[PDB]
């Protein structure tokens, strides 16, 4: 029990601000090479291993540098080549990325990787996006440029070998802006095109660069989205909107498995305690300005009834107070309203002399 | 359903007071009295109310068989100390659906009646009283 | 209770309800209760409405 | 039966019908073309068959 | 756990010390045991398929190495018994409140 | 919309001093009052203001029930050190939707009531003060 | 833990003057009353305030029994010495928990009432005084 009387004094690094919810920014890359198997991450330019092809390289500098900024943290995984991608799309699920594409690219893998995205995205709840060539898929997963011969640094570039461009290109934007009307200082060179195609392109939601005014630049920043559903709505087609909604999905499965899973009872006290909990995250949201100011989170009615109806229990005489607070298990239902901002994209103007 | 045999009758009930049942008792009543203020909305011309709280008052009465009421109080009260109690009544009529049992506490009384007599009369003593809670059991 | 006074051999077709409670029952006694026990949150339902 | 707990967040823009139980405004017109036979509802000028 | 290997008896002792070591109003679902390092892999629905057998286990997930649920080791239910009886920690205050009447 | 069950009702307020809750208050009163000049235009009749600060004030009435208020500035009074505190109000009316909850910062009070007391009069303290800064929490 | 029993009664009270104790008492008061000037500091709205000091006064009903008032003071005050006296107060409430003992000093009284009658009217007397300094006693 008792020791000899001892002092200690003790230096340590300050704590600051708050830990990142979701890490973002991080960029997902494969390519196939005989040598440098395995995971390989690169942070700045300098630390490039020297065995890889040039011709790797060039795709490898192309995803360094980015839109507005470098991105945060990119991802090189290596594969011999020969062999079916399925194996190094398993290997990857266990790490974490914002974004995927194939420099080296075929018709048959483009489809195995559209199903893989979508079926990890709905089955897993697991948010990912990914950068195709030429590919008609219509979940938000997957951002498809449109573009032939791409004349970057006084060489040919094909649709495949610029979505390493294109993606981190998007990567290096911020939360708040958009990769609209962002003019690209490396190409050059586009084929020509009318600008009624244009529209008729952008309409079927493929990603096109556009020659504009001046410089070149991204036309649009619309999703792969071209069937609109009755519960899916027309603004689900933006790439902004639809980061966003990611970003807060992952930031918040975070917070209930680390604070509110198997450690409080499923009361309705606790309910309202998660509830402010909620909010107050949506108003540090709000305070960083990417949502609407009056966001709301309010106890799921019409959901909770229809399971206690299930249960078997009659709900004629209970008032709505009691209905909140009935019973339920461990079974929790909430629903919340929010309003998602949107940077400038159509300006009109009438000027009365 | 309804029918003249279901009415309860004041001749089954019993009290029980401080833990003790009381055989010598006549009547007893308590009553909650709640207090509203009167609202005029502008518009409409028919008032409306808001309910702020309620006072609880009622009444013992008993034969006077016994100093019972004495040994309770009386030396209490001089001293300056106030007793509360707990009173419990119910009502069982074999003709009516069952009985209904009832709690008051937090009694307090309202005065003393050291003695009341009169020739060729019976004596009596009542007593009334405030209460504050009270309890439902076996309610019907 | 009910079942106790009938395999006793009382008769208790005019026997009240309210008087059925407190017959004679000898040493046992019958009691029933109901309670609802609370458990810790393990599912989650959010629907934010854009 | 009983699952690994589950924490599923799922969005969905709000839509309002406001509609009441009868319903105003459907004009039904036939008529005689070679190709595209059968009801074919429109909404819009744009989604009008080729 | 600790550079050592052990076989499914030998982590009963650490099974056994989590579980009474939580007060009586959490349970032991999704609790993290920073100790344990390594497990052999397991598919998710194989683990879903487990957890419906009536089995203990140890699952992957996103963080430290943690516990999958809390169930019991019954299956079948009766018309007496249903799936309240299941969780460990209902169990446990039934049969506190049990001891104490 | 407005119904007669809507307004506030007093009783179901509660106030917490400098962290400690106090069960035996009666009112809790917090007013700014502000600070306006006469400005009187050329050209136009109609007088018109001008507005230059605010100045607080309050006031806190609670039952005898103990010494609370003694031990809070008596010493520190005599020796030339002026307290400051902080209060907390919430008024929550299960009938009224939402619940208002305010801080008033840096309360001076204004005096002490050592003693007072009457024949067959139950004690109350009153104490009024003044404030500078408020702070919302939770307004409906 | 707040009930309506610990409320301070003042018949339970008592006073003490120059030592010798005063049973025919109606009510007693003493009172701090704080001076406080009012400060404006540039840049922020709210006006504050600085405590300089604080005054003391209170006042003391009694039946007129006996001429206590008089001997007193009524011979000094000609001559030109103006005494000084020492009050005690104790407030011992059964039903409260504790009583508090409060000592007023450097009292000096401000009037002097040689005869105050009316026909069909009990006598009272009452006399403000101010004082200088106190002590606690055994607060609750």
Redesign the interface.
Do not use: Q
């Given at each position: 029990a008792i020791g000899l009387p001892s002092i200690n004094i003790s230096f340590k690094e300050l704590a600051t601000t708050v830990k990142e919810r979701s890490a973002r920014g991080i960029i997902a890359m494969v390519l196939k090479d005989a040598k440098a198997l395995g995971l390989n991450e690169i942070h700045e330019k300098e630390d490039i291993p020297v065995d890889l092809s040039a011709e790797n390289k060039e795709y490898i500098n192309l995803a360094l540098m980015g839109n507005v900024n470098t991105p945060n943290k990119l991802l090189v995984y290596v594969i011999e080549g020969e062999a079916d991608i399925q194996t190094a799309l398993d290997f990857l699920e266990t790490k974490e990325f914002n974004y995927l594409c194939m420099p080296k690219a075929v018709e048959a893998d483009k489809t195995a990787i559209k199903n893989w995205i979508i079926k990890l995205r709905d089955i897993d709840?697991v948010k990912v996006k990914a950068v195709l060539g030429k590919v008609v898929g219509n979940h938000e997963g997957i951002i498809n440029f449109t573009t032939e011969d791409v004349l970057v640094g006084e060489k040919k570039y094909s649709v495949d070998e610029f979505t390493s461009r294109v993606a981190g290109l998007i990567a290096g934007t911020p939360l708040s802006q958009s990769v609209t009307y962002t003019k690209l200082s490396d190409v050059v060179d586009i084929p020509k095109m009318t600008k009624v195609d244009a529209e008729s392109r952008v309409n079927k939601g493929e990603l096109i660069l556009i020659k504009e005014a001046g410089a070149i630049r991204i036309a649009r920043g619309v999703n792969s989205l071209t069937e609109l559903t009755?519960?899916?709505?027309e603004?689900?087609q933006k790439i902004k909107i639809v980061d966003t909604?990611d970003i807060?999905?992952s930031d918040?499965?975070k917070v209930?498995?680390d604070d509110?899973?198997?450690?409080?009872?499923?009361?309705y006290d606790?309910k309202c305690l998660?509830i402010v909990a909620i909010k107050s995250y949506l108003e540090e949201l709000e305070k960083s300005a990417l949502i609407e100011s009056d966001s709301t989170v309010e106890i799921?009615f019409e959901?909770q009834k229809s399971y206690l109806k299930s249960k078997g229990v009659d709900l004629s005489y209970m008032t709505l107070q009691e209905i909140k607070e009935a019973?339920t298990?461990?079974?929790?239902?909430?629903?919340?309203?929010?309003?998602?901002l949107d940077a400038m994209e159509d300006i009109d103007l009438s000027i009365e002399i | 359903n309804m029918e003249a045999r279901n009415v309860m009758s004041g001749t089954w009930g019993e009290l029980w007071l401080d833990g003790n049942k009381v055989a010598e008792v006549k009547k007893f009543q308590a009553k909650m009295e709640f207090t509203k203020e009167d609202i005029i909305i502008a518009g409409q011309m028919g008032t409306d109310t808001k309910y702020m709280g309620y006072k609880g008052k009622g009444s013992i009465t008993l034969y006077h068989v016994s100093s019972r009421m004495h040994k309770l109080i009386g030396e209490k009260i001089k001293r300056g100390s106030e007793p509360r109690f707990v009173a419990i009544s119910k009502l069982n009529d074999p003709d009516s659906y069952g009985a209904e049992r009832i709690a008051v506490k937090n009694i307090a009384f309202d005065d003393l009646t050291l003695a009341d007599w009169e020739v060729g009369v019976k004596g009596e003593i009542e007593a009334p009283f405030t209460f504050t809670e009270y309890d439902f059991l076996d309610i019907i």
């Open positions: 709840k009755a519960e899916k709505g603004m689900f909604l807060i999905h918040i499965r209930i498995i509110y899973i198997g450690k409080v009872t499923n009361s606790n998660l799921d959901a019973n298990g461990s079974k929790v239902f909430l629903k919340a309203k929010i309003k998602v | -």
